[PDB]
Design a protein around this ligand. Structure first.
Ligand code: NI
Ligand code: NI
Lengths: 122, 100, 570
């Protein structure tokens, strides 16, 4: 049998990511005129202001995509994405400074998002 | 001839490629370093001839074939990268999967 | 959402159940368990996971459970298991084996493996990670030998020598307090861990013992200095008081005794038996019988490993040029022929496979190759698999049991034998971060990156004048760990307890980390991981046939080996 040095012989099956966490589908639109690409682990409510979507549905969540991959939005593009729940302590600090604490404080997160112009605060 | 550090090092790629070409001319299937040595020197020499980066990206995939090298060698080389001085300055050439 | 396993292993390295070929051998290792949380794997780069507020925690200072370095997605191959995990290092030591990341938002993060502002990242996805090799049979004869050893994944050199002096070219010995002090000072400039052996020769305790007090980390008894019953006895008395190991290369000539006399002089005390097969030295022709006793920690040197068609021709000639043997002299030919035996070299392959010889070493530059300890260990395992089949202990098509038995021979077993396994020898929490990353295609052949005390010391990397580091020529090069004063913090000089208590390091101005040799007098063959078999080895004095448990141990020499002409330019 031909030898490929260091080759893999992977087992059978598939790997399910983020297993057991609630999944959510939402429609997101890039209202900007430059492309936006969002990574798997950024708190979704804190993404670029010009992405329009129901901001409350991004709280305490992130994209449900393979760790280290990203969703891309061309200028003007609208599309559906699937979110999964953040884990661990379910706390977010920094990034856009919308949360800085538990993700359970939805009212506070949405007030900050709305004051700063993050589109789609219901 | 005011050699800098990179010029001194890249002389050794050329040495190695001369050594590998003699081994191929006496009928040997080439190994991993020999095949890399050989494709890297082709790339550098092509830049010295004034070829473009796009020409060397194509031609570097035809310098060695699987029947020139040992089993497993084609699959070990995912790409080969070399920097050389073209007519318009130093540029990077990458040859993806050079041997098939 | 699900990922097929081929893509998963492409992105994150293999996971539970997946197998990986070692270089171009026939050996396959299988991932036994995985510490990750699928979907929260750590990775670094543009738009990846270890970013502030995400997989990197932006709140914690360095002392609050944050790492200095995370190796992501490593396939660990070690005596403790073959498994997937993140490896976290802090203050130059391994502090966490598990799952790195940010407990803010990720599940299953090991509590002291937080990636924070202070963490540097090494991607190990798709690499095999092992401890650095521990070579306990080094002749210090040419400082160019250190890069040679680092390039094949060796991170600790134990042995002796003062350069190309004839005592050093023959014996791993740095004789006396002054030579030892000089070589301890020389060692400040070698980018590798080092332990120095004194001469284990003398008939009064004081001349031997003053070497230990001067800074030696153990002793070497060699037949070129007189491997007599008295030298043996005095060295082992010094060693039992000092808590250091003694290595022996016994009297090949049988001048003052036969093997049973050397054993009687040892008198049940612990001792490391070097090149136990005997081509490298030792009572002719039955020194390898030493490997059956409970108080012997047996090692092979690497030129006989494994048994090949050129081995005997090469050794006979090697022996005659080293000893300046003459063709013409019948006593020189009889000595050669009593020393270089096909019967014992073939049986040495099998005794490694059975777990009867517990360790490998090089014998660097005195009948041994400094950069081939690791290489030849895997060549032997591959030959044994082809000649003897999968061990009976194997499960699932994998060679995990054999990989753990053989990886132990050059990592943890030499560390245990020398009294330094509290510091090095394996990938465990609390041990020094000497780690070797390997692409699977080069496993055991050419190390990718060698980490010493948590900083890369040596790496296969390309043109320093290029736009990126991968353009040719890719070659082994010393990195920032070896430069300036960082060479002191990334490397350990191992020394006896008494020299440390007597303040030899401050006397000499040593700035390296000082490691303490300890706990090597009350161990035995049973303490050798995966290689703890004691048995009655019989060597026929007429035929040189080796028998264990009533069976002859024999195998054929091979014409070709993996990890050879596909990789090397010469
Ligand atoms: Ni010896
Ligand atoms: Ni030796």
């Amino acid at each position: 049998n031909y030898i490929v040095p260091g080759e893999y012989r992977v087992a059978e099956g598939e790997i399910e990511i983020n297993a057991g966490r609630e999944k959510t589908t939402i429609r997101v639109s890039n209202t900007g005129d430059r492309p936006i690409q969002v990574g798997s682990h950024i708190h979704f409510v804190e993404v670029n202001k010009e992405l329009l979507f129901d901001r409350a549905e991004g709280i305490g969540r992130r994209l449900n995509i393979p760790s280290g991959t990203a969703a891309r939005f061309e200028p003007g593009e609208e599309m559906e994405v699937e979110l999964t729940e953040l884990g661990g302590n379910r706390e977010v600090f920094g990034i856009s400074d919308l949360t800085n604490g538990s993700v359970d404080n939805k009212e506070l997160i949405l007030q900050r998002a709305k004051e700063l112009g993050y589109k789609g605060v219901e | 001839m005011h050699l800098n550090p990179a010029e001194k090092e890249k002389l050794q790629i050329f040495l190695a490629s001369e050594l590998l070409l003699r081994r191929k001319a006496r009928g040997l299937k080439l190994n991993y370093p020999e095949a890399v040595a050989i494709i890297t020197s082709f790339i550098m020499e092509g830049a010295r001839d004034g070829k473009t980066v796009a020409m060397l990206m194509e031609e570097g995939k035809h310098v060695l074939t699987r029947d020139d090298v040992m089993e497993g060698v084609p699959e070990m080389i995912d790409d080969i990268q070399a920097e050389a001085t073209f007519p318009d300055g130093t540029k990077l050439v990458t040859v993806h999967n050079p041997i098939s | 959402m699900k990922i097929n396993r081929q893509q998963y292993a492409e992105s994150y390295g293999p996971t539970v159940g997946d197998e990986v070929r070692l270089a171009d051998t026939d050996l396959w290792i299988e991932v036994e368990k995985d510490y990750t949380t699928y979907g929260d794997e750590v990775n670094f780069g543009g738009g990846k996971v270890l970013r502030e507020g995400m997989g990197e925690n932006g709140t914690y200072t360095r002392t609050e459970n944050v790492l200095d370095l995370l190796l992501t997605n490593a396939l660990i191959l070690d005596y403790t298991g073959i498994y997937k995990a993140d490896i976290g290092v802090k203050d130059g030591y391994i502090v966490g084996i598990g799952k790195g990341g940010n407990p803010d938002i990720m599940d299953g993060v090991t509590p002291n493996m937080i990636v924070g502002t202070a963490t540097e990242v090494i991607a190990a996805e798709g690499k095999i990670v092992t401890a650095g090799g521990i070579d306990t049979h080094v002749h210090f004869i040419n400082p160019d030998q250190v890069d040679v050893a680092l390039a094949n994944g060796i991170t600790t050199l134990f042995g002796g020598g003062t350069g190309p002096a004839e005592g050093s070219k023959a014996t791993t010995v740095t004789p006396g307090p002054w030579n030892i002090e000089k070589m301890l000072k020389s060692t400040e400039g070698l980018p590798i861990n080092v332990g120095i052996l004194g001469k284990g020769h003398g008939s009064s305790i004081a001349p031997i013992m003053e070497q230990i007090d001067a800074g030696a980390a153990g002793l070497k008894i060699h037949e070129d200095w007189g491997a007599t019953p008295a030298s043996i006895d005095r060295s082992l008395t010094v060693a039992d008081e000092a808590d250091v190991q003694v290595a022996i290369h016994s009297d090949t000539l049988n001048e003052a005794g036969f093997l049973e006399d050397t054993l009687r002089a040892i008198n049940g005390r612990v001792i490391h038996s070097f090149h136990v097969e005997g081509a490298g030295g030792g009572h002719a022709p039955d020194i390898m019988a030493m490997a059956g006793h409970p108080n012997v920690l047996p090692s092979s040197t690497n030129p006989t490993r494994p048994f090949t068609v050129n081995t005997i021709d090469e050794h006979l000639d090697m022996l005659m040029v080293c000893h300046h043997l003459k063709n013409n002299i019948p006593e020189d030919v009889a000595f050669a022929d009593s020393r270089i035996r096909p019967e014992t070299i073939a049986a040495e392959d099998i005794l490694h496979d059975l777990g009867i010889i517990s360790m490998m070493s090089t014998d660097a530059l005195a009948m041994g190759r400094a950069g081939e300890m690791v290489l030849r260990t895997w060549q032997t395992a591959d030959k044994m698999k082809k000649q003897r089949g999968p061990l009976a202990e194997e499960k699932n098509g994998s060679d995990n049991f054999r990989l753990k038995r053989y990886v132990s021979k050059y990592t943890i077993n030499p560390a245990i034998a020398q009294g330094i396994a509290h510091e090095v020898g394996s990938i465990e929490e609390g041990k020094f971060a000497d780690l070797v990353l390997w692409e699977p295609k080069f496993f055991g052949v050419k190390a990718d990156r060698v980490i010493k005390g948590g900083i890369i010391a040596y790496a296969q990397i390309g043109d320093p004048s290029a736009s990126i580091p991968t353009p040719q020529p890719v070659m082994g090069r010393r990195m920032y760990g070896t430069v300036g004063d960082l060479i002191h913090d990334t490397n350990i000089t191992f020394m006896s307890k008494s020299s440390i208590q007597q303040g030899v390091p401050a006397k000499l101005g040593l700035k390296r980390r000082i490691g303490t040799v300890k706990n090597c007098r009350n161990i035995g063959k049973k303490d050798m991981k995966w290689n703890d078999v004691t048995t009655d080895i019989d060597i026929n004095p007429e035929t040189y046939e080796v028998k264990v448990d009533g069976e002859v141990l024999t195998c054929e020499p091979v014409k070709e080996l993996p990890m050879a002409q596909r990789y090397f330019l010469f």
